[PDB]
Structures are given as structure tokens and as C-alpha cells.
Amino acid sequence: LRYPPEMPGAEVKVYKKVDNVDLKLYIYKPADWKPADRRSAIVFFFGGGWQSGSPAQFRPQCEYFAGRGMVAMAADYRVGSRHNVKVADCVADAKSAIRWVRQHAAELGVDPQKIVASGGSAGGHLAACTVMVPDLEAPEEDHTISSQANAAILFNPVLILSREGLRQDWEERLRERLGTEPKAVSPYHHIRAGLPPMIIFHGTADNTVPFETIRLFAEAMKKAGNRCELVPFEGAAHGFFNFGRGDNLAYQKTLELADEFLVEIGFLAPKG
Numbered sequence: 490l491r492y493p494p495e496m497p498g499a500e501v502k503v504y505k506k507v508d509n510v511d512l513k514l515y516i517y518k519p520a521d522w523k524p525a526d527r528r529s530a531i532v533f534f535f536g537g538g539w540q541s542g543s544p545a546q547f548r549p550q551c552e553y554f555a556g557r558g559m560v561a562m563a564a565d566y567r568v569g570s571r572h573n574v575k576v577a578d579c580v581a582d583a584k585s586a587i588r589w590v591r592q593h594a595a596e597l598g599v600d601p602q603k604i605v606a607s608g609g610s611a612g613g614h615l616a617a618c619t620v621m622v623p624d625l626e627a628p629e630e631d632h633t634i635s636s637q638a639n640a641a642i643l644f645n646p647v648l649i650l651s652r653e654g655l656r657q658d659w660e661e662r663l664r665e666r667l668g669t670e671p672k673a674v675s676p677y678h679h680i681r682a683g684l685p686p687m688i689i690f691h692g693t694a695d696n697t698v699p700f701e702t703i704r705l706f707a708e709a710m711k712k713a714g715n716r717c718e719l720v721p722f723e724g725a726a727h728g729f730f731n732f733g734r735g736d737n738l739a740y741q742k743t744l745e746l747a748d749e750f751l752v753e754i755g756f757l758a759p760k761g
């Protein structure tokens with residue numbers, strides 16, 4: 490995972506300038522893309538503990554979805570190792586990415602109500618925040634344009650960041666680590682009716698993010714009346730879905746299931 494990545498075949502757009510860094514989108518268009526198209530879009534956020542990682546992680550998935558007619562992109566965002574930020578800054582960057590795609594939907598050939606947020610682990614957390622967590626800051630961007638994604642596809646996300654409703658000192662410690670009140674960046678704590686649809690892929694033998702946290706999330710989302718499809722991968726570990734692991738079997742399966750989810754919600758045309 491090189492940073493910055495090459496991302497061969499990607500067009501590069503700076504979606505945000507902040508702390509003297511240009512944050513980029515690596516954009517993959519379908520071969521028949523034309524101006525004035527209104528395609529569904531997907532924005533992928535890499536994983537890495539909000540500390541490290543690279544948009545290269547989701548290059549294969551971007552190529553797949555561009556092949557299916559989406560405008561597919563991988564977003565850079567600030568991380569601890571490179572930028573000395575905390576989780577709340579990462580969340581602001583992810584929201585800025587969705588905002589930017591919506592703002593620029595016309596020139597991207599994109600339907601601004603068919604923008605999917607996606608990511609792995611910490612990036613799956615970010616994608617979830619774009620669907621369901623209120624904005625915590627108003628950066629220098631179009632405030633009239635919503636940051637909220639229209640759907641999410643999450644690969645073993647972190648979804649519970651506060652222990653409330655499940656130690657005042659631990660919540661104080663988390664406040665310092667996250668850059669805000671832990672509940673304010675905890676998707677689980679913002680479960681309500683009327684949220685965008687999503688699909689989640691999670692291994693049952695995940696020792697980083699316990700499967701039980703995701704089962705609790707999905708159960709509560711379903712009780713609130715939301716479409717929240719949880720696909721367990723029996724015995725699979727954290728990062729199982731990545732391109733280049735386990736003969737690409739879980740990679741291919743998550744794409745197949747994600748594709749069908751996007752068909753189900755009317756963001757993709759059926760194959761053939």
C-alpha cells in the first residue's frame with residue numbers, strides 16, 4: 490500500500506485543501522462515460538486505524554464498479570501518522586468528500602441522490618458517519634449541500650465507539666483520543682428511523698472489531714425500520730475482503746453481494 494498511490498487510470502481531483510495538504514479523489518469512470526450522464530457514484534475510504542493506509546486499498550473495487558457503469562472513486566483523508574489528526578478530523582474529511590461529489594455531481598456525470606459511501610474498518614466507520622452521524626464542523630465548503638451519502642457498503646466497519654448504553658474515565662480518555670465526545674463519532678449511538686440503506690460484510694472471527702458489535706448494530710437498525718443487510722463471513726478474520734487475500738474468494742463474493750445490493754436499491758442496472 491504505497492502512499493501516495495499511483496492509481497493508474499484514475500483522474501485526480503482535489504476535494505479539500507486543509508492544514509496545507511491537498512486531499513484527493515482518485516476517480517474511475519465507465520468507458521462510455523459522457524458529460525450529462527447521471528450515474529450512481531461510490532466513494533471508498535481506506536482502512537488503517539485512522540493512523541495510516543492508502544486509497545490504493547480500494548483500487549480493484551473502483552475498477553469493478555466503473556466497469557459496472559458507476560463513477561467510482563477512492564478518497565484520501567487525513568490520518569494520525571501523516572497529519573497528526575484525530576478521528577473527528579477524519580470524519581470531517583469523509584463528509585467533505587461526499588459534499589464535494591454532490592456539489593460537483595453534474596461535471597462528474599453523477600446523480601447527486603445516488604452517492605454511495607464505502608470503506609474498510611476505520612474507513613467503514615467513516616462511511617457510516619457520512620450516512621448517519623451529524624456533521625460536527627462546518628468547514629470552508631458549500632454548507633447548503635448535504636454531506637449525507639444515499640447508501641453505504643461497509644467492509645468490517647468500526648460502528649460502536651462509546652460504551653454508553655451497552656466508566657466516566659474511559660469516556661474522558663476517548664474524548665481526548667477522538668477529538669470530540671465519543672458518541673458524536675459512534676454510528677451505533679445515532680441509530681434512528683429513516684436512514685439510508687446499507688450492507689455490511691463482517692467476519693465472525695474478527696479479533697479487531699468483534700462481530701457481536703456489528704450484530705447489535707444491524708439488529709437495532711432493523712428494529713428502527715432501516716434496510717441494513719448483514720453478511721457474516723463464517724470464521725473470517727479482520728481484512729478478509731481485501732483483494733489479494735484467500736485466493737480472492739471473499740473479495741469476489743463481497744463484490745457480487747455489493748453489486749446485487751446496489752441493484753436492489755435501484756442504484757445499478759441489473760447485469761445483462
Ligand SMILES: [Cl-]
Pocket residue numbers: 694695696697726727
Ligand atoms: Cl481478526
